[PDB]
Amino acid sequence: KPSYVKFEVPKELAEKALQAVEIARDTGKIRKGTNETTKAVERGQAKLVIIAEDVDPEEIVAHLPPLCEEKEIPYIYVPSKKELGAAAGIEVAAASVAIIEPGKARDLVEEIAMKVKELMK
RNA sequence: CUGAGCUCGAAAGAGCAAUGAUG
């Protein structure tokens, strides 16, 4: 486990976020890679943000949790950049992803957003 | 900013790329 995990995770919650990224992909609005993830926040209203637990250097995503406390935005880690990339519809690894519109996945974002907001306290 | 594309020979497939191709 890296230095920037602000909370620990079972096999669940991070796998439910992985299949949330799939369902938003064509049915809603998704943005790809850590720069587009960072833009998604600063343009004022992301819906959620996803990060890979296996990043090296780890310091390159360390600006996302702080930025997510300034913007009141909820976030969650998933087991690898290579399975995050696959979920996002691409074949290169992705250190992070952002949700602009959940599509079909509105109520799937809502039930995990609520649980993120408690395991963060 | 855009945000996925690019490099090559043949009968072919490998490599680069969201840790950023194109512009």
Q: Provide the CATH number for the domain around residue A14.
A: 3.30.1330.30
Cα radius of gyration (chain A): 13
Does the CB of A55 sit below 7 A from strand B?
yes
User: Where in the sequence is the domain holding A20, given as residue range(s)?
Assistant: 1-121
Cβ atoms of residues A88 and A97 within 8 Å: yes
Q: What method was applied to determine this entry?
A: NMR
Cβ atoms of residues A14 and A7 within 8 Å: no
Overall domain count for chain A: 1
- Strands A48-52, A96-101: pairing is antiparallel
Does the CB of A60 sit below 7 A from strand B?
yes
Nucleotide closest to residue A32 (CA–C1'): B18
